[PDB]
């Protein structure tokens, strides 16, 4: 399923995932495609911070959902 990850700089990245994927895996896909280290990623959906060991299904994230990515230690 396709999901969208919106970053604070107005860039949105599209990812292909399965609800069974863990949050840790999602973070690894984002590192692979945009180069951001997983330790700097904070993922937010429906006002909850997503935890690494849970799966997307745990949070009821359905196709075409948008997660927000905040980076630990933001410049400016």
């Amino acid at each position: 399923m396709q999901i969208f990850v919106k970053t604070l700089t107005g860039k949105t990245i599209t990812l292909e995932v399965e609800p069974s994927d863990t949050i840790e895996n999602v973070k690894a896909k984002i590192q692979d495609k945009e180069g951001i280290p997983p330790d700097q990623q904070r993922l937010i959906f429906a006002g909850k911070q997503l935890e690494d060991g849970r799966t997307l299904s745990d949070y009821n994230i359905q196709k075409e959902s948008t997660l927000h990515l905040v980076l630990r230690l933001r410049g400016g």
Partner: protein, 114 residues
């Protein structure tokens, strides 16, 4: 200083079926920062003291705003900018004078915390 960052009297609403229904109970909306530094947007039933809603909110997750077309002029919505999620509230402060200041404070403490 105190416990709550922001508090004010307000009722909540709930979705029953497909219908947004005001809950008649006297309530308190408040924002509290816990010792893990997280910010909680809460609604408490004043009669029972039970906290029925407790949402951890991060900066830019949501916006609190007046719902203009309600003739009361006292309905507000906490709108989650990502997703369709909305929580409706209705001011229960006896005077309307501070409604807009309460709303302003909600936004400040959710979107610009210390």
């Amino acid at each position: 200083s105190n416990k709550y960052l922001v508090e004010f009297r307000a009722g909540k609403m709930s979705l029953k079926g497909t219908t947004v229904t005001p809950d008649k109970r006297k309530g308190l909306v408040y924002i509290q920062q816990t010792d893990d530094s997280l910010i909680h947007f809460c609604w408490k039933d004043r009669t029972s003291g039970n906290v029925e809603d407790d949402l951890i909110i991060f900066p830019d997750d949501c916006e609190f705003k007046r719902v203009p077309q309600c003739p009361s002029g006292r309905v507000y919505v906490l709108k989650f900018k990502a997703g369709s999620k909305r929580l409706f509230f209705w001011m229960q402060e006896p005077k309307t004078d501070q409604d807009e200041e309460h709303c302003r404070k909600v936004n400040e403490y959710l979107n610009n915390p210390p």
